[PDB]
């Protein structure tokens, strides 16, 4: 302990104290950034859900078109 105390390399160079208001502002800024990231992820999830709904509507339309084509082919074959 005494060797590290008296050591010119081991006696550390000092620096001043922090700012509590700046620390609180940094914490609040990190919280707001996390909230913005959550909002962006929620908007992306909503857009992906809308795209999935549009894809389901397109798949239903394609299935209806295929059923109509098959019914027309069956009617033509019967005629």
């Amino acid at each position: 302990d005494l060797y590290e105390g008296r050591g010119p390399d081991d006696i550390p160079r000092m620096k001043p104290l922090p700012k509590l208001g700046d620390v609180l502002q940094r914490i609040r800024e990190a919280i707001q950034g996390l909230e913005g990231e959550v909002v962006r992820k929620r908007s992306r999830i909503e857009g992906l859900e809308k795209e999935k709904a549009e894809i389901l509507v397109r798949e239903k339309e394609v299935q209806e078109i295929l059923n109509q084509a098959g019914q027309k082919y069956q009617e033509v074959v019967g005629g």
């Binding site: 105390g5 550390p12 000092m14 609180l24 914490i27 999935k52």
Partner: protein
């Protein structure tokens, strides 16, 4: 066309699941940070002290701050606390304690009062201060000490040196009592200089 729509829907569902997981994680982190900020604001806005003496009122305020910091450290899980948040809390505690220690050390006599009012809180929060932690020694550059450690070094070691110069050599019992009381939070450099 149906296969293309199914592939697009599967990709959209995977993206939605990933975005929902990211949103849940970010919301949990934001809620934790908001709770930490609310606790910090509650600690920063404490009740007033009825002590008439300025030194006694500052000692009571420092004791209340140290008790609140110790309660917050006990409530927060060590495994659930991020290292960045821990360093921010330690720096904030150092900044809050340094002006109070500067205002109190002028009116504090280390010979008359070997043990201060907030010495127990300082001994409890020494783990948060980092004295109990092992030092981080580099290979080439000398490591600058902690903020609270360096502030304690400067102010407390200067006050202890002033007390050692002022006190009589023939009666070292009060100085030894002060050293024994404050030796828990005293860093090695300050202890070596005082010795």
């Amino acid at each position: 066309e149906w296969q293309s729509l199914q592939e697009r829907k599967a990709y959209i569902d995977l993206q939605l699941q990933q975005e929902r997981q990211e949103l849940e994680e970010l919301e949990a982190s934001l809620q934790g940070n908001r709770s930490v900020t609310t606790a910090c604001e509650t600690a920063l806005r404490p009740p007033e002290s009825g002590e008439l003496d300025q030194k006694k009122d500052l000692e009571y305020r420092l004791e209340r701050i140290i008790a609140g910091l110790a309660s917050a450290t006990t409530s927060l899980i060590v495994g659930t606390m991020l290292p960045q948040v821990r360093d921010e809390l330690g720096a904030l505690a150092v900044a809050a304690i340094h002006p109070l220690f500067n205002q109190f050390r002028q009116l504090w006599d280390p010979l008359e009062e070997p043990k201060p009012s907030f010495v127990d809180g300082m001994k409890e929060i020494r783990s948060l201060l980092g004295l109990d932690q092992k030092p981080k020694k580099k290979t080439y550059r000398k490591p600058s000490a902690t903020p609270y450690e360096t502030m304690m070094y400067e102010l407390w070691l200067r006050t202890v040196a002033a007390s050692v110069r002022e006190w009589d050599v023939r009666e070292p019992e009060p100085l030894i009592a002060v050293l024994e009381a404050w030796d828990a939070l005293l860093p090695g450099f300050v202890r070596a200089q005082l010795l």
